[PDB]
Design an enzyme around this catalytic site. Structure first.
Site, PDB file in Angstrom:
ATOM      1  N   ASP A  52      26.994 -30.645   3.614  1.00  0.00           N
ATOM      2  CA  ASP A  52      27.103 -31.959   3.409  1.00  0.00           C
ATOM      3  C   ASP A  52      26.822 -32.288   5.276  1.00  0.00           C
ATOM      4  O   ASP A  52      25.692 -33.149   4.963  1.00  0.00           O
ATOM      5  CB  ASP A  52      28.233 -32.212   3.123  1.00  0.00           C
ATOM      6  CG  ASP A  52      28.608 -32.794   1.782  1.00  0.00           C
ATOM      7  OD1 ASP A  52      27.391 -32.859   0.701  1.00  0.00           O
ATOM      8  OD2 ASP A  52      29.788 -33.068   1.445  1.00  0.00           O
TER       9      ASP A  52
ATOM     10  N   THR B  75      28.345 -40.526  -0.938  1.00  0.00           N
ATOM     11  CA  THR B  75      29.066 -40.491  -2.527  1.00  0.00           C
ATOM     12  C   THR B  75      30.397 -41.342  -2.560  1.00  0.00           C
ATOM     13  O   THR B  75      31.363 -42.165  -3.266  1.00  0.00           O
ATOM     14  CB  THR B  75      29.513 -39.711  -2.913  1.00  0.00           C
ATOM     15  OG1 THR B  75      29.816 -38.430  -2.400  1.00  0.00           O
ATOM     16  CG2 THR B  75      28.042 -39.103  -3.604  1.00  0.00           C
ATOM     17  N   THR B  76      31.631 -41.105  -1.645  1.00  0.00           N
ATOM     18  CA  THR B  76      32.233 -41.438  -1.840  1.00  0.00           C
ATOM     19  C   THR B  76      32.748 -42.561  -0.354  1.00  0.00           C
ATOM     20  O   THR B  76      33.615 -42.763  -0.734  1.00  0.00           O
ATOM     21  CB  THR B  76      33.632 -40.880  -0.745  1.00  0.00           C
ATOM     22  OG1 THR B  76      35.005 -40.782  -0.339  1.00  0.00           O
ATOM     23  CG2 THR B  76      32.434 -40.241   1.212  1.00  0.00           C
TER      24      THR B  76
ATOM     25  N   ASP C   3      34.482 -33.888  -2.057  1.00  0.00           N
ATOM     26  CA  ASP C   3      33.254 -34.713  -1.630  1.00  0.00           C
ATOM     27  C   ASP C   3      33.333 -36.152  -2.548  1.00  0.00           C
ATOM     28  O   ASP C   3      34.659 -36.085  -3.501  1.00  0.00           O
ATOM     29  CB  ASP C   3      31.488 -34.632  -1.624  1.00  0.00           C
ATOM     30  CG  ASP C   3      30.082 -35.403  -1.916  1.00  0.00           C
ATOM     31  OD1 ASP C   3      30.599 -35.915  -1.113  1.00  0.00           O
ATOM     32  OD2 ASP C   3      29.398 -34.334  -1.652  1.00  0.00           O
TER      33      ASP C   3
END
Lengths: 103, 107, 104, 514, 127, 102
Positions: free
Chosen positions: D382, D81-82, D48
């Site tokens: 996720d 987030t990435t 992540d």
């Protein structure tokens, strides 16, 4: 949660020590009732028997000293069983109230 | 500061613990002085009766010993009033002051 | 496993218990003896000499007042001689338990 | 130690390079897997943008702040987030060149602002109000899972994902606080994953087939001891008084037979028959001679239950905890519609479904009980957080670079704030947008220049949001591929990038203190 | 901070109990001083001549007759004979009652000092 | 190290008999309060073991006066005994601790 179980078992053990002082306190007295009633029957009872404890002598006879000896010995052995059942019932009661509270 | 007023009511708590145990003695001494009066009011056979405080036991007639043993339960009857009024007073002193302590520290 | 050192452990502990019994009887011996000399020195037979037997009292001569204490000193000292007769008997086995480890 | 005029800015931007460079192949299906053995000294499989930050033993202060910043994004979005890591070092790259030309960072920061709200103006322009139908929810759930795991594993999981979020629409909830329980099944293949509407109990009641099929379950979620520990104390533990400890022994054996007799009165109190079932979930072990006697009464009695299951069974099914089995009405207990004891592995795993209130839906994955089972755990996590945003918004957008070049066309060509001071920051801002489509396709083999000229023309030709096919390297239209992003997700990555870019840009000294 | 206070609160607990036991001993000493006055109250009031059962020794009682109620022994000093009257004997008993109270009164705030300091360590570990 | 406790036991044994004297010291002052009230109103005896021997009041005043003085003689030697055993052992706590280390 497992904290209400492991702490409630500590609560029942502390009442086993609260059970511990009261029953053995009476239990030391019944053996004193054992040694007294045997020496009275072996010795002469025609002369008048009194009851001497700390602070009082009441002038009595043998026929008034004798029944309370057999009475106070029998009352002790009932209560030391009675004090066992009540405090062990109390340990069962606090465990279920801890489980119904913090759920 | 505020630390000093905390310790005052905490020191008042242990005075209640002293007040709680005095009433257990004085209730026992009334009933036990009543209990020994019953056993001598039980007999009618003999006026011989021994009283004492130490290990001495003086020879007296039982009837004067009754009225003295009537006074023995009575003084212990007199003290349970003044202690319980005191024990409630020290209880009211610390607990009502304890209402002042925690709610204004947590405020 | 050794049974002679089982006797050797019992032997040394019997040495210790005997010597302590002698010391406590010697102090009781001097206690009665010095109790004799102090009461004779002060106030011999004038009218009467009260002597304690519990909480009741007897009035008699000064030398008979010593005499009850004199007898207990005689009984106590004969024990001290008999105690040391057992202190001596616990030493002879101690010299002999050294060989019995090699014998059996 | 102090950091002066050039160096304090330089360490910040150079660290943002290699942070972006190592975390390059982590977004989308081109995103490769990563392992940490330098975060805890253990074999760990992790993917992540936020979780890789939290595990690595980072000492550069910028990446520590981004781990705090992307945490606020990870609480809402998850993946993305990435996405945020890629655009930061690219944004810092263009503005540093102006500072390498010689320019204040603040005038570029001034140009970072008005460039942003035009893109924020563009987000309302480019948002596509689609329905929240299951197949539309599948396409969001496909691209979320294929980012983290394989596509063959994704499509099996995508079946289990999109049905639970339709169950939370029954509770009218746009967000996901429950129905998110990930249960793990002992297997050797993680190819299988089962969806249970109710719960999954992980135990099997030592004397089996007590009542393995319960059509009328009245649940009691308690922790009553029947194997009771028996102690003799005088000090709180074992004491030397042998006289005292003996008298407590006669009451210790009276507790076990006490709890056996209480079960019998409760079965006749609740059921009255054996046609209606009754289920006891005990968090502790049960006597097997009790499990023989309770089985004949019409009771199944599950034992050694997990303490995490203890609260969740009370929420959906019901049943409160006691230390007795006193006479209780069915109002005090909960209900389950169907109870079945399932077996896979060395443990029996009793399925409990169709609750009194189907409020929590258990996601039961199978697997070889490895870090692969851990890797499919946070992937579907996720996966659920992405489609959490789908129930939040009304506009599901074709992403993967479709908005990215579409913003940069309007930003560069049309000066929003035609005064030249802010358009400098626009040029760094619009060139920051290019990094996501251009390098993942360049990783796929078709390099970054062939990808950009294709998607800029086609979107300017069509207006249809052409994205990038991450498995060929060429732009294909993301509306039919099913690589989509939410209106909730794409705003925050624009939000979280800009604020954390400006403050580290506007430093001049990094001093050792404390 | 905290490992020092956990050792510190356990030391003060013994110091309370060592002083409080010394309080419990001195109450027994003044107990017989109350007890000797109350034996003496019956003595002057009754008369000479009445029969008493006194301990010849432990658990063995001898009878006797009562004479000279106005002259009593007071055991003070290191174990010394002091003949007094019965009237001055009551004053010296109550003087010894207040004396044993005075022996506990010097311990009593110091007994409470060891208790309040231990509670403050319990607070400082808590704070 | 046995030398640590040995100097403490020889000090503490002397303190226990010294604390015996202090209750006797107070009651030696109690009897002097009571002998001052007697001038011939009540004579005194002496309780010495199993024999109760006649005294006089002047004989009593010297008797408790001597025993008051013998207590104070044993007080002052302990003050020498206190400081010597605490200083000798303090020197021993440094040197004899190093013997067990190396």
């Amino acid at each position: 949660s497992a904290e209400q179980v492991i702490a409630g078992f500590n609560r029942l053990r502390q009442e086993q020590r609260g059970l511990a002082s009261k029953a053995a306190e009476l239990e030391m007295e019944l053996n004193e009732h054992s040694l007294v009633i045997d020496t009275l029957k072996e010795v002469d009872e025609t002369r008048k028997c009194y009851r001497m404890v700390g602070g009082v002598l009441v002038e009595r006879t043998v026929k008034e000293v004798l029944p309370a000896l057999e009475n106070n010995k029998e009352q002790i052995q009932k209560i030391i069983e009675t004090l066992t059942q009540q405090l062990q019932a109390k340990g069962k009661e606090l465990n279920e109230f801890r489980e119904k509270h913090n759920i | 500061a505020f630390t000093e007023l905390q310790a005052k009511v905490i020191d008042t708590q242990q005075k209640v613990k002293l007040a709680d145990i005095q009433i257990e003695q004085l209730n026992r001494t009334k009933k036990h002085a009543h209990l020994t009066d019953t056993e001598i009011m039980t007999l009618v056979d003999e006026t011989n009766m021994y009283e004492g405080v130490g290990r001495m036991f003086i020879l007296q007639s039982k009837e004067a010993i009754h009225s003295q043993l009537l006074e023995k339960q009575k003084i212990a009857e007199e003290k349970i009033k003044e202690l319980e009024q005191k024990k409630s007073y020290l209880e009211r002193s610390v607990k009502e002051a304890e209402d002042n302590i925690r709610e204004m520290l947590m405020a | 496993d050794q049974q002679k050192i089982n006797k050797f452990a019992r032997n040394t502990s019997r040495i210790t218990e005997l010597k302590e019994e002698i010391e406590v009887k010697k102090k009781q011996l001097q206690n009665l003896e010095d109790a004799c000399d102090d009461i004779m020195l002060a106030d011999d037979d004038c009218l009467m000499i009260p002597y304690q037997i519990g909480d009741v009292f007897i009035s008699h001569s000064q030398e008979e007042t010593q005499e009850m204490l004199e007898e207990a000193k005689k009984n106590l000292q004969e024990e001290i001689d008999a105690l040391e007769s057992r202190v001596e008997s616990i030493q002879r086995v101690l010299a002999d338990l050294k060989v019995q480890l090699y014998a059996k | 130690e102090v950091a002066r005029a050039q160096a304090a800015l330089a360490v910040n931007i150079s660290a943002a390079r290699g942070l972006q460079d190592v975390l390059r192949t982590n977004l989308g299906p081109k995103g490769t897997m990563k392992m940490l053995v330098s975060g805890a000294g253990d074999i760990k499989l992790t993917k992540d943008g936020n979780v890789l930050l939290h595990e690595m033993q980072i000492q550069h202060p910028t990446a520590s702040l981004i781990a705090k910043v992307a945490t606020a994004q990870d609480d809402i979005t998850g993946d993305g987030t990435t996405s945020n890591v890629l655009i930061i070092g690219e944004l810092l790259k263009q503005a540093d060149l102006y500072i390498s030309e010689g320019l204040h960072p603040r005038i570029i920061t001034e140009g970072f602002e008005a460039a942003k709200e035009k893109a924020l103006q563009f987000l309302e322009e480019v948002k596509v109000s689609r329905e929240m139908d299951r197949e539309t929810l599948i396409d969001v759930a496909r691209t979320s899972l294929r980012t983290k795991v394989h596509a063959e594993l994704a499509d099996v999981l995508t079946e289990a994902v999109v049905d639970s979020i339709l169950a939370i629409k029954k509770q009218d909830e746009p967000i996901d606080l429950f129905m998110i329980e990930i249960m793990e099944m002992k297997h050797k293949s993680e190819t299988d994953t089962s969806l249970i509407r109710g719960l999954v109990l992980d135990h099997g009641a030592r004397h089996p087939d007590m009542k393995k099929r319960v059509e009328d379950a009245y649940i009691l979620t308690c922790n009553v001891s029947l194997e009771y520990e028996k102690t003799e104390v005088n000090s709180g533990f074992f004491y030397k008084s042998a006289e005292e400890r003996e008298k407590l022994v006669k009451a210790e054996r009276k507790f076990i037979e006490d709890r056996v007799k209480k079960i019998i009165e409760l079965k006749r109190k609740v059921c009255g028959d054996s046609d209606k079932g009754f289920v006891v979930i005990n968090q502790k072990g049960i006597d097997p001679f009790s499990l023989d006697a309770l089985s004949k009464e019409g009771i199944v009695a599950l034992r050694r239950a997990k303490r995490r299951n203890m609260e969740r069974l009370t929420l959906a099914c019901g049943g409160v905890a006691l230390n007795s089995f006193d006479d209780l009405s069915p109002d005090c207990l909960g209900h389950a519609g169907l109870v079945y004891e399932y077996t896979l592995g060395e443990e029996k795993f009793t399925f409990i479904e169709k609750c009194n209130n189907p409020r929590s839906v258990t996601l039961l994955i199978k697997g070889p009980n490895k870090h692969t089972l851990t890797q499919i755990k946070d992937a579907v996590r996720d996966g659920l957080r992405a489609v959490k945003n789908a129930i939040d918004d009304g506009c599901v957008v074709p992403g993967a670079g479709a908005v990215e070049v579409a913003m940069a066309e309007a930003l560069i060509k049309h000066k929003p704030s035609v005064k030249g001071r802010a358009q400098l920051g626009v040029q760094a801002f619009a060139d920051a947008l290019l990094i996501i489509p251009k390098v993942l396709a360049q990783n796929s083999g078709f390099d970054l220049q062939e990808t950009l000229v294709k998607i800029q023309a086609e979107h300017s030709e069509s207006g249809q949001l052409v994205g990038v096919d991450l498995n060929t390297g060429e732009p294909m239209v993301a509306a039919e591929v099913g690589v989509w992003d939410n209106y909730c997700v794409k705003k925050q990555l624009l939000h979280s990038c800009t604020v954390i870019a400006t403050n580290i840009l506007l430093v001049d000294e990094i001093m050792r203190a404390g | 901070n905290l490992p020092q206070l956990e050792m510190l609160k356990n030391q003060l607990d013994q110091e309370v109990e060592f002083l409080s036991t010394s309080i419990a001993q001195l109450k027994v000493v003044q107990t017989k001083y109350v007890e000797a006055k109350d034996c003496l109250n019956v003595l002057n009031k009754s008369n000479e001549g009445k029969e008493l059962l006194v301990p010849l020794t432990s658990s063995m009682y001898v009878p006797g007759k009562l004479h000279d109620v106005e002259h009593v022994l007071i055991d003070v000093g290191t174990g010394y004979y002091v003949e007094k009257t019965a009237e001055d004997a009551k004053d010296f008993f109550k003087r010894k009652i207040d004396f044993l109270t005075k022996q506990m009164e010097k311990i009593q705030p110091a007994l409470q000092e060891k208790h309040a300091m231990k509670q403050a360590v319990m607070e400082m570990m808590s704070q | 190290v046995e030398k640590y406790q040995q100097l403490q036991k020889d000090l503490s044994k002397s303190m226990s008999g010294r604390q015996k004297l202090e209750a006797q010291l107070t009651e030696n002052n109690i009897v002097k309060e009571e002998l001052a009230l007697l001038d011939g109103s009540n004579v005194v005896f002496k309780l010495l073991g199993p024999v109760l021997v006649k005294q006089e009041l002047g004989e009593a005043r010297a008797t408790v006066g001597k025993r008051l003085d013998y207590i104070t003689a044993e007080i002052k030697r302990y003050e020498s005994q206190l400081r010597d055993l605490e200083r000798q052992s303090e020197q021993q706590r440094e040197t004899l601790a190093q013997l067990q280390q190396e």
